[PDB]
Amino acid sequence: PRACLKCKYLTNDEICPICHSPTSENWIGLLIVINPEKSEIAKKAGIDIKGKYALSVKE
């Protein structure tokens, strides 16, 4: 969709559902977290919430 400037969470909305922070279209790369509890990658990155995430974001 678009990607939140703060947390990188992917959404279509102009404000992020997780925290109401502005989202941009200029985002790159993708991390899909299916299970936060059991993902070592999500641990490292520091994602509590399951969902799609960009890897880089800019305005």
């Binding site: 299970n35 059991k38 070592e40």
Partner: protein, 138 residues
């Protein structure tokens, strides 16, 4: 125990998306999936077992099969943790003025650009921050 799946180039994000879906629908023990722009042709898939991934990719379009061996979460960490210059910092241009030292004068946290006053010879140069490395810090 992170695996690596050989896909068609430029279809990594597409396929990741469907991998996520099939894995939730079919209840396979797939925990995260990673597609980096730098890692074209490959979608990294984190999973309990190789079988999960073989079941995941079974009949997947544009997927050419799984690479042997695992990759460790040590090796992926660069891709999962990607600046911080200040006006007055001296930098070297690393990408037309390669090798040139310069003082920073305006830092654009928005366009993610940086405006530079070269040491050599006459006009301000603006560059993406990507294209410059810090040398001195003030």
């Amino acid at each position: 125990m992170i695996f690596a799946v050989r896909t068609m180039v430029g279809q990594e994000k597409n396929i990741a998306g469907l991998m996520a879906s099939r894995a939730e629908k079919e209840q396979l023990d797939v925990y995260s999936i990673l597609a980096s722009e730098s890692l074209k042709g490959y979608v990294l898939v984190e999973a309990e077992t190789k079988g999960d991934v073989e079941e995941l990719i079974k009949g997947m379009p544009r997927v050419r099969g799984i690479v042997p061996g695992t990759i460790a979460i040590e090796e992926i960490e660069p891709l999962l943790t990607p600046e911080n210059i200040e006006k007055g910092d001296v930098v070297e241009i690393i990408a037309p003025f390669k090798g040139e030292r310069a003082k920073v004068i305006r830092v654009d946290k928005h366009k993610e650009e940086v405006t530079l006053e070269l040491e050599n010879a006459p006009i301000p140069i603006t560059l993406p921050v990507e294209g410059v490395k810090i040398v001195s810090k003030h």
